[PDB]
Structures are given as C-alpha cells and as structure tokens.
Amino acid sequence: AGLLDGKRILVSGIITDSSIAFHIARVAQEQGAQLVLTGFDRLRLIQRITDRLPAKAPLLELDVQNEEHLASLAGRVTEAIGAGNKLDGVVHSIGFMPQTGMGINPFFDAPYADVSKGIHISAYSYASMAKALLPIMNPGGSIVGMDFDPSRAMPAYNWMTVAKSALESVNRFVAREAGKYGVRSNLVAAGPIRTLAMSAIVGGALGEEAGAQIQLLEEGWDQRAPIGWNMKDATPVAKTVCALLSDWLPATTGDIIYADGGAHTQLL
Amino acid sequence: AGLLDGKRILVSGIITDSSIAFHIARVAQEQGAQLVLTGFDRLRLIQRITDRLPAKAPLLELDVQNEEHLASLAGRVTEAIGAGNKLDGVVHSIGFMPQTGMGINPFFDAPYADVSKGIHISAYSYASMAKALLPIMNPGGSIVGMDFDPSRAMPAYNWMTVAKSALESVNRFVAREAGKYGVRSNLVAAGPIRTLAMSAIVGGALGEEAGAQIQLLEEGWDQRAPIGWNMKDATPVAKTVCALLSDWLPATTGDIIYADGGAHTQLL
Amino acid sequence: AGLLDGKRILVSGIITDSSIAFHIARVAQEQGAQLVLTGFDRLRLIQRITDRLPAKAPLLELDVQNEEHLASLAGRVTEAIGAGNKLDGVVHSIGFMPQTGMGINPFFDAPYADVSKGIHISAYSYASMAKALLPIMNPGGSIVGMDFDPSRAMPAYNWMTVAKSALESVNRFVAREAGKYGVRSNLVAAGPIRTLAMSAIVGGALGEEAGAQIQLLEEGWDQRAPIGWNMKDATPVAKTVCALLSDWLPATTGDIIYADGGAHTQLL
Amino acid sequence: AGLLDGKRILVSGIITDSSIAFHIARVAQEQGAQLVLTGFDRLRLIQRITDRLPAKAPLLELDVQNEEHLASLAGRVTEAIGAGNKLDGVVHSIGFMPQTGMGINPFFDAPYADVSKGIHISAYSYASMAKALLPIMNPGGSIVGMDFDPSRAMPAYNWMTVAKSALESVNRFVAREAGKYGVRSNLVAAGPIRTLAMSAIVGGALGEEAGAQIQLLEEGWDQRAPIGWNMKDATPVAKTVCALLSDWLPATTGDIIYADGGAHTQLL
Ligand SMILES: NC(=O)c1ccc[n+]([C@@H]2O[C@H](COP(=O)([O-])OP(=O)(O)OC[C@H]3O[C@@H](n4cnc5c(N)ncnc54)[C@H](O)[C@@H]3O)[C@@H](O)[C@H]2O)c1
Ligand SMILES: NC(=O)c1ccc[n+]([C@@H]2O[C@H](COP(=O)([O-])OP(=O)(O)OC[C@H]3O[C@@H](n4cnc5c(N)ncnc54)[C@H](O)[C@@H]3O)[C@@H](O)[C@H]2O)c1
Ligand SMILES: NC(=O)c1ccc[n+]([C@@H]2O[C@H](COP(=O)([O-])OP(=O)(O)OC[C@H]3O[C@@H](n4cnc5c(N)ncnc54)[C@H](O)[C@@H]3O)[C@@H](O)[C@H]2O)c1
Numbered sequence A, B, C, D: 001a002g003l004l005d006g007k008r009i010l011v012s013g014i015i016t017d018s019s020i021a022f023h024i025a026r027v028a029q030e031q032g033a034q035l036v037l038t039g040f041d042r043l044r045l046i047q048r049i050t051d052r053l054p055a056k057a058p059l060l061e062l063d064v065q066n067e068e069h070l071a072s073l074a075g076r077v078t079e080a081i082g083a084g085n086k087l088d089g090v091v092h093s094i095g096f097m098p099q100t101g102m103g104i105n106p107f108f109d110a111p112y113a114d115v116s117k118g119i120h121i122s123a124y125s126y127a128s129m130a131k132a133l134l135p136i137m138n139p140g141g142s143i144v145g146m147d148f149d150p151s152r153a154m155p156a157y158n159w160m161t162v163a164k165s166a167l168e169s170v171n172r173f174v175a176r177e178a179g180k181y182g183v184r185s186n187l188v189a190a191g192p193i194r195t196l197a198m199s200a201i202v203g204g205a206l207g208e209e210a211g212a213q214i215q216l217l218e219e220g221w222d223q224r225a226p227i228g229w230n231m232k233d234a235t236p237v238a239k240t241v242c243a244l245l246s247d248w249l250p251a252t253t254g255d256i257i258y259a260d261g262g263a264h265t266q267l268l
C-alpha cells in the first residue's frame, strides 16, 4: 500500500552508495515501485552497489553521449519489463562538467570543447532521454530531473551553473512534448548534498580557493533555511522526487519544486 | 492506509459545495485525515453543506477580522480534538475583495477602506491564523494557503492581484516563525476554478466588460497548459494541497507550488 | 544641454538633507529640469532644507492619506507651473511603517491598524498620485517610484517588505492606466542607504536585536555586489531615477530597475 | 554634447541595414561616440552597408568560433584607436542557431552538433569577447549583450530559447570578472524585431507551421504592451543599449533591462 504501488519506474544516475539516485531508488522500492536501473561506464561497480537496494532490479547500460545506446533503449527496457507493459516514471539524475569548468581555473579559461561536453551530459540528455522513453510511457506518467538553483551566480560552480540554467529551459520544452502523451515533466532543485565528489572538492581536489568557497557556500543553506538543512541526509530529496512520481501532484508540469529547506526564499 | 492517515487537520473556507475548501476537505477525509472545520457568518448553511462530506466533522465559527474569535480559537480547537492532542495541519482557503476592487469600476476608483478590508481578509489573516494555531501544532506539521499567480498584471482581477502579491510576501515571513515549531508554510497557486462567485462574474455581476475579460482570461489557461486545464474540476487542486499536508514534501517551506496544468511556464 | 533639459518634474519625499528625494532633486536640477516639490507635515523644515538645492523650486503640501490634498493637487501644480503647461515627470519617494511593523516586536504582534497605515502610505499612494497627476501629464512622460527588493524574506524589515511586494504589484496596474496617456511607470529597487532613520535603527532605536540584524543585512550588499556598494552615497540611485525620467528608456514600463551594485544577481 | 560624447565603443553584429547592431551604431554616433566595428564572413557586404552610417568607422574581422581571431582582437583594436587609448564600451549583438534547432523539425530532432554550434555563437561568445576585451577597457566601462526573454517556453524558437537561458547565466558570471576592472555587464531583452531573417521565417522559410506560430507570437507583444510595440522600429531598442553604455545606470550589473513595451509585465 505504498505511494508508488504497482508503478514501473526507470532510475538513471547511480555510481556509488552516496549518489542521490541510490536514495531515490531505495525510497521508491520501499513505496512499492518496480524498478529498471541505468548505469554508465563502471557496470561491475554499479551492479555491486545496487545489490544493497531492498529489492533486485535489472541493470541496463546507458551512456547519454552514445547514439546507439539511446536508439536501442526503449527495446531493452521493454525486454526487461515484459512485452505489453509500459513505464509510469523516469528519473534523470545525471550530471558532469570537466574540472576546467568548475573552479580549477578562472571562468574565462574553460575551453568550449569542455563546456560543450558538460552541457551535452547535464542538459541536452534530459531531452534525449524523454525522446527515447516517451513512446513506452503510460498516460498519467511522470519524468523528473535533478537541478541546483542557478538564478544567481555563485563562486566555483561556474559553467555547471550555466548547464543548470540550460536544463531548466529544456524542461519547459520537454513538458510541451510530454503533454501529448499525458505525461508530466518537472525538476527537483535540491540543497547541497555531501556525495563522494562534493566531499573531495571540499577537501581541495579542485584547488584550495574552490574548496574554501564551496565549504562556505554549502554552510549558508542551513543558516538561511527556516527548517534547517542537513547536507549529509539525502532522504528529504528522495521523498520529494517520489512525490512528483506519484499521482498527488497531477496538475504540475514544466516546473521546479525546491527541496532546499526553504533557503531560496530567505535573504538572511 | 491513506496519504493523511491519523493526521488532525483544520480546514477553513467552506461556504458552498463549489468552494475549493469543500474539495480539499473531501479528499483529506478519503485519505484518512480527522478534520475540524471553520466557517464565517452563514453557519446554518455551512453545517447543511458539510453534512455531504464522507465523515462528520465539528464546525467552529471564525471571522478573521474578529480579535475575540482569534484569541479563543486554540482553546475551541483543543476542546473539539480533546486535551493532550495537537493539530498536524492547517488549510487557509479564505479570500475577499469588495466589488469596487475587482472591476465594477476602474482600478483608480477603489477607495482605500475597501482595499484595506480585502488585504485584511486575503493576506494579513494568513499571519493571524498561524499566530493563533502554531502553539497547538505538532513538529512535522504543515500550513497551506490558496494563491492565484500575481507576478503579472491582468484585466479585472485588479486589487485582488495586489492582495495575492501581499499574501506571497506574508507566506515567506510565516515560514520563518513556523520553522521554530518544526512546521512548514506554503501556498498552492491554482488555475481558475468555476465557483459560484466566478460563474456570476462571467455572467456579468461586475459589469459586461469585466465578465468578457474574465471569460477570455480563464480560456487562456487550457490553451497554454501542456497537460490542459479543466476549470470545472477542483480535484487536481485538492490533491496538491493534500501532497503539501503529507510527509512527502518535507524540505519545502516559504514556497509556492503551481497546480495550473503548467500554464505559467508557457508564453503561448 | 542636460539629460532633462526643458522637462517639468514633480518630486515628492524630501524631509531632510539625507532623503533619497533630496539627491534625486539635486541631480535633476543639475541636468536642466524645472521642479515642483511636495512635502508632508513639517513644511517649515522642508522649505529650509530645500533652500540648499542648486535652484529655487515651489513647495506644495501633500499628505497622501488626505483626500482633499489629492483632489486639489492637479490645480495647485498647474498654478505653480502656469496655465497651458503640463508635467513631463513624477517622482514618488514616500514610505512609512509604524515601529510595530518593523522589528520593535515580533512579526505576529503588529496590529492590522498599523500595517494598514503602512500599506496606505507606502503602496496605495503610488496609485493615488498617478490618478491625481496623469490628467496633467504630457505624452512621453514618466512616473518613477522607490522600491527595496522584497522577493525574499529578511530579518527586521518585516511588514515594510510586505508593503514593497504590494507596491511592485500596484506599479504593474499603474503602467496599464498610464499607457493610455503615453506615460511610462517604473520602480527603482535601491540598495540600502544610510538616511537619518536607517542610522537611528542601526544605533538601536527599534531594539538591539533589530539593529544588529539591519547592520549585518546592510553589510552583505557590498560583499555580494560585483562593483561594490557604498551605503553612504545616494548619487548612483539619483542618476538611475533621472535615466528613467529621460527619453533614453522609451520602451520600459510596469518594470523594476535595480540600482544595487548588482547584489541581487549573486548568491555569495 | 551627446549622451556618449568622447566614448570609444566596439560594436559587433552588423550584417544588413535591418540588423539591431546597425541601429545601435547609428544612435551611438548621433550621441558623439567614436566606434570600432566587427564583422563576420561577408566583409565586402558589411563595409558597403556601414558606409551608410553618419560617420566612417574602422571595420575588423571577427568570427567568434575562431581562436586566432579572439587572440589577436585586443591588439587589432589598439591599432585602430591608437596606442595609449582604451575602450569605454562593448556591444555583443551576435546570435545563430541552425534551422534544425528553430522549428524546421520537432524539438527532439535537433542533433547536438547543431545545438552546440548555436550555444557557442549565442552564449559562450559573450564570455569569449569579455575575456579578449576587458584588458583594454577603462574603469567605468560597460559591456552590453542582446537577449530575448526565455523565462517561459514558446512555439518554434525551440533551442534558441535554451541558448538565451544560457546567455543570461553567462552574463551573471561575466559581471563578477568585469567588476575587478570597474566595468558593468548587462543584457537588453528586446521585443520582436522584423529583421531580414525574421521576415523570411514569417514568410515560411522554416515551414508553414513555424511561420504561422512566429507571426501569432510576434502579434501578442503589441496587444500586451501598455505602451504598445512596433516590430518595424528598432530605435527604442538602440536608445536602451545607449542608456546602458552611458554613465546614467552606474549601479546596475549582471542584470537584464527589458525594452519590450512592458509586454513581459502583463498576462493579458
Ligand atoms: N550533490 C549535490 O549537491 C547536488 C545538488 C543538487 C543537484 N544535484 C544533481 O543531482 C544529479 C546527480 O548527482 P549526484 O550529486 O548524485 O552525483 P553522482 O556522481 O553520484 O551522480 C551523477 C551521475 O551522472 C552519471 N553520468 C555522467 N556522465 C554520464 C553519461 N555520459 N551518461 C550517463 N550517465 C552519466 C554518473 O555515472 C553518475 O551516476 C546531478 O544532475 C547533479 O547536478 C546534485
Ligand atoms: N476560484 C478560483 O478561480 C481561485 C483560484 C486560485 C485561488 N483561489 C483562492 O482560493 C481561496 C478560496 O476561494 P474559492 O474560490 O473557493 O471561493 P469561496 O467563496 O468558496 O471561498 C472563500 C471563503 O472565504 C471566506 N471568508 C470571507 N471573508 C471571511 C472572513 N472575514 N473570515 C473568515 N472567512 C471569510 C468565505 O466565507 C468563503 O468560505 C481564496 O483565497 C481564493 O482567492 C481561487
Ligand atoms: N533608505 C533606504 O535604505 C532605502 C532603500 C530603498 C528604497 N527606499 C525607499 O525610498 C523612499 C524614500 O525613503 P528615504 O529612505 O529617503 O527616507 P525619508 O524618511 O527621507 O523619506 C520618506 C518620505 O516619506 C514621507 N511621508 C511619510 N508619510 C507621508 C504621508 N502621509 N504623505 C506624504 N509623504 C509622506 C516623509 O515625509 C519622507 O519625506 C521610500 O519609499 C523608501 O522605502 C529606501
């Protein structure tokens, strides 16, 4: 009798046990959803990590920059869920920006080849995934992507902020296409989460200046948030994604839900 | 095993069977919530209307302009739910603007005494209700109010648009105070709903010009909405309010959720 | 050969030599404008203060809460500028909120009579002034009001923030009416300025807590602003108001121009 | 005694007599500015077109995708304005999106190679130009770029809307870097202008459906604008760019000024 009882949902973006997608997958399974998982490059690691989920789920390879992977995706998902069955939900939890684009060097020194790779994976792929999966989605379905509020500039995040501004625009166009299938498209703008990569940045992987800036930036959320913010807890973010995958927000599309403790609503 | 199983929720704003609050109350009861209702002026009518809800609920008198009604509210609610029990949710579904403020005459011709009455009932009362009820709310609780997107000016809505801009500001301050109690505060910005008063305006109760403008304004929503908009169906709005009252959006506060078919995200 | 050569402009809001309106008036006169000034309550003080402006200007009494003052305003201005002449510009630099509404006590403890007085003077009066003066304004004319960004909640500003949210909504409706006369209506959202009242608040006139919060709040602007922010210098704000009064922003109306050093565009 | 008397300004983006940059260049020269022009690919055509400007100006070749052109730009500008002299202003009026990205085919059918080329020219190049020219800019200087409001999705504009969302984000980061030189960075969001390319689209160059959608979209501006909108008149847009290049908006940076007749402030 869970929130997502009987729903078939595809979850992308698991790489480690600290991935936001790992927590989305765990909460969705606790709420009765039947999952299909997609992974990039390190498939042996991803299978070993996902063995720790409450229930066993099939794992499919998906590199969003690979045209062949995207062209065969719908057929591979149909084989995993069985003929005559369709998806009720899709979770995009994919992001990447080369070090040159995220504070290892000044904003002006990031080459366009690096920025373009980052925009392909972080923004264009949201449209790529919707194109591939909408023909195998049921009416009343839901597509959810992960965002980080880019309305104002900030230190070190640099070109990844630009990629998120592009993603928010892409989401509004995806909602127009998804609407024809009776499917909603929305993003969850989360507060900062201490994943393995974020902890490494704070530890100085992109230089001391960038590390100090990210640490101070992350600390501002708990101070501003009227209900506080715990960067070591991904469960409130996972619950918000599940709310959008459910039948309980049926009139919301092309939109952004903020799971940030209310920090974006307060100046100080 | 409903979305709101075991929750004690106060619902204000029922006047007829077409009130948005009537639909919020019905959905909340179908989802296992135990309600307390508040009504203004026509208590015999409200009792007769609420006899049609799935379950019987106690009805309390509340005029938000009456200081005595607000001062005794917490004690009257405690008597209705029993000593030692507290509320888990509060629904503000209250609004009013005199005819002079809503298109019966030009924008510049509305006297301040009329505008002030409208702002008292539609915006200040959101803070009044939170002040009265937060001392009897449990941690993890939720306060929800009804909004109509006022970010851009529009024909005929006139000073009620100004009252909604004030309400959105009030909501951000209420979230600061509610946070100290472990309580969230949010608004649902709904698309237009054909209540008795809205149908009367379309029928020309505020003059032909205002009626023609409101009819054309309301018709724009379904055209712009990627998933469409049915002004004769309040159920998607009621479901969204219940989503905010639940434990499934635990990191959202001082915010606005749009239940408008995605119309605010599209230009044409 | 100044920016405003030959223009007839009404400037409201002068009380002391630290008033934002005093600096707007000085810059407008240096740029060739012919002024008419309006003052409230302390007319002997205002005449003595305005004797320090580069040129002598007629001073008229205007209490925005007084219906008689507003009804006679157009006739009194016509007498001052001469029959057959009209205004090219209007500056609204009026604001007030009782101490109960600005941090001397908690947000929930401000009585509605006090909040209503504050909203009348700070927001409704923008519509009152436009109603009185549009019949004596030339096509190509400009109305400008003073704003303080209220999109996010902040400590101590409390109900004055709510009044500014209402003012921004009022400005969008005033633009609809002013457009029929070929007149623009806009607001300037300024960064914090150390006027006599603001210095007194920092000095603890509204209590130590409010003073400490306002001081820290004000200090954040210079840190966030890419070009910095000097709270002791009103000249950049006065120049921005003159830009809107000129013929150089002819396609901007119902809008907000930010003269805050770019602080609102940066998170940290 | 013009608005820009004695200022040295670089203007990019002239291709025909209908280019927005042609009108910016003409108004800047009428206001006393000394110009340097940059052109792409068709240099013989651009020289012939710019012979019609009020004053003769040097023309330099600049393809924003060419690393060599950008590396030599500052030296070539210094040679044109003379040693010991620096620029006071820079105008970015550059945009491009392949037909696949602007309605000749569905949104999902635009290949990433085409979208990436469009984002390089329309958004990344704003950062490229600032990097090349800031070392030869005077304190008090100004950088201005051209925008088209992308906050909401719209028919046919498709991936060019996504490119504008990226440009707005880039502008906020450019303001951080430019601030170190005492230079402002802002965008002008203009209403639709009937350039040669826009007239060809309305005439069906990108298919009948796209043409019909663009014509209806463009027609909405004049209806919504409180002061109206003339798509055949670029002079109000050129005046707004000159206002930002002047000393009259000295506290505005990382921002957007809307020269759209106030259309973005009104729903209907
Ligand atoms: N961590 C935070 O503070 C935070 C906050 C808000 C939003 N987000 C967003 O949440 C999402 C998930 O990030 P995360 O923080 O969990 O980090 P993560 O490293 O755990 O997840 C990112 C995922 O992207 C995948 N990926 C990269 N390139 C790919 C490609 N070519 N094809 C397919 N998959 C590819 C990686 O394999 C990985 O699984 C991202 O969109 C991120 O921007 C993160
Ligand atoms: N109908 C729409 O199109 C629409 C759309 C979005 C939001 N809303 C908002 O939803 C809310 C509910 O409105 P509705 O459309 O259901 O209409 P409604 O007439 O059914 O409800 C408004 C309620 O306000 C109550 N009220 C008025 N003055 C009061 C006072 N002094 N004290 C206490 N209660 C008082 C009335 O008794 C009534 O129950 C309002 O805030 C309205 O602005 C309506
Ligand atoms: N000082 C700041 O930090 C700051 C920043 C942004 C915006 N503002 C705004 O600028 C405007 C001017 O304020 P200021 O800071 O120069 O302070 P101020 O005290 O010098 O000016 C406010 C003016 O309002 C007038 N006023 C009050 N009640 C009135 C009434 N009933 N009728 C007519 N006039 C009345 C006062 O006489 C005074 O001249 C206000 O709208 C204020 O909110 C101030």
Ligand SMILES: NC(=O)c1ccc[n+]([C@@H]2O[C@H](COP(=O)([O-])OP(=O)(O)OC[C@H]3O[C@@H](n4cnc5c(N)ncnc54)[C@H](O)[C@@H]3O)[C@@H](O)[C@H]2O)c1
Binding pocket: D012, D013, D014, D015, D016, D018, D019, D020, D021, D039, D040, D062, D063, D064, D065, D093, D094, D095, D096, D121, D146, D147, D148, D189, D190, D191, D192, D193, D194, D195, D197, D198
């Ligand atoms: N026309 C409108 O309705 C409208 C409205 C708002 C904003 N804009 C924006 O105004 C700007 C100017 O466009 P326009 O409408 O005057 O059209 P336009 O065709 O006259 O100008 C665009 C310019 O971009 C140049 N360009 C293209 N690729 C280039 C490259 N690789 N290197 C250098 N220059 C390159 C072209 O040569 C041309 O001069 C664009 O950013 C456009 O998006 C246009």
Ligand SMILES: O=C(NCc1cccnc1)NC1CCN(c2ncccn2)CC1
Binding pocket: A095, A096, A097, A098, A099, A148, A157, A160, A191, A192, A193, A197, A198, A214, A217, A218
């Ligand atoms: O989006 C975020 N974090 C949000 C944030 C911003 C500021 C402060 N705290 C948190 N992280 C993603 C994670 C995936 N990516 C990545 N991972 C590995 C290598 C390269 N890139 C891109 C960045």
Ligand SMILES: O=C(NCc1cccnc1)NC1CCN(c2ncccn2)CC1
Binding pocket: B095, B096, B097, B098, B099, B148, B157, B160, B191, B192, B193, B197, B198, B214, B217, B218
């Ligand atoms: O907020 C709305 N409607 C939203 C809307 C706007 C534009 C087009 N369609 C819908 N209605 C409320 C209802 C309660 N009020 C009221 N009721 C009775 C008498 C006076 N006022 C105030 C107005």
Ligand SMILES: O=C(NCc1cccnc1)NC1CCN(c2ncccn2)CC1
Binding pocket: C095, C096, C097, C098, C099, C148, C157, C160, C191, C192, C193, C197, C198, C214, C217, C218
């Ligand atoms: O709007 C402002 N200041 C903006 C601000 C906000 C936060 C930090 N720094 C600056 N001041 C006005 C001034 C006129 N008013 C007033 N004056 C006298 C007595 C009562 N009220 C109302 C408030």
Ligand SMILES: O=C(NCc1cccnc1)NC1CCN(c2ncccn2)CC1
Binding pocket: D095, D096, D097, D098, D099, D148, D157, D160, D191, D192, D193, D197, D198, D214, D217, D218
């Ligand atoms: O940005 C605009 N127009 C704004 C607009 C949007 C919707 C309705 N009316 C106007 N035009 C530019 C012009 C330069 N570009 C271009 N030119 C030639 C070939 C390819 N691309 C890119 C598009």
